[PDB]
Amino acid sequence: AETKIVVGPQPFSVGEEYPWLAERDEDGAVVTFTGKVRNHNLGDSVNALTLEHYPGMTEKALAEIVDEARNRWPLGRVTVIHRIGELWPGDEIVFVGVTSAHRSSAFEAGQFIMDYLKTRAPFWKR
Amino acid sequence: AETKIVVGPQPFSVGEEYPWLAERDEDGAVVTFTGKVRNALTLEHYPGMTEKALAEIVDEARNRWPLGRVTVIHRIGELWPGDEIVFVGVTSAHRSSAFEAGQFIMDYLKTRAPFWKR
Ligand code: NA
């Protein structure tokens, strides 16, 4: 069961990520989450969200969240992508994909990974 | 917000369905589920009534959670291992809303919807 972890400034495309994620026949249940910049992430009028990461450490922390999810649920392929840089309301900034034999596992793991990425993975906002 | 409901034998592509599901800025959280076939399973449905039933299950979801766009697609006909047979796409501005609604639609679609094996 492969894991893909990428962090960078470029737009990602779910259509380009999904086929790898869902490739394996034994991965019968496929869950994705895409998170975009909200208008509440700003709240005032529109200036940009600027996100920075810590090269190496951010990806490590993401890797460790996925490992932890794999200790709790029987997961197949997992992808975690996080965009950084200057971002605006409506931009796709995070993608988590998880597979499993059971849908419950995929749903619960997908949520676990997002929850922990939001509270543990080191990013700096401004 | 709009609801897309499709039932038919044709393959779907998540990459083709996703941009519509995810178009609106207010729809800042996008959850999808895809179920695959785990010889030739033939899946049948109740023409008319199952589409109506999918529409009803989504409407009930909208009563419980603040959703934006939603897509439910289910395949019928001949199907083989590894074929993607069901796609449920739910959006919200809020993660727990979209995850709970996605799960609610799937549960009711695996225990109550009128699809069956021939
Ligand atoms: Na967008």
Swiss-Prot record, chain A:
One of its GO terms (biological process) is Mo-molybdopterin cofactor biosynthetic process. Keywords: Isopeptide bond, Molybdenum cofactor biosynthesis, Transferase. The keyword Transferase applies. Changing residue 114 to A: 4-fold lower activity than wild-type. Its EC number is 2.8.1.12. Converts molybdopterin precursor Z to molybdopterin. This requires the incorporation of two sulfur atoms into precursor Z to generate a dithiolene group. The sulfur is provided by MoaD. Belongs to the MoaE family. This is Molybdopterin synthase catalytic subunit. It comes from Escherichia coli (strain K12). The lineage of its organism: Bacteria, Pseudomonadati, Pseudomonadota, Gammaproteobacteria, Enterobacterales. The chain holds residues 2 to 127 of 150 of the full protein.
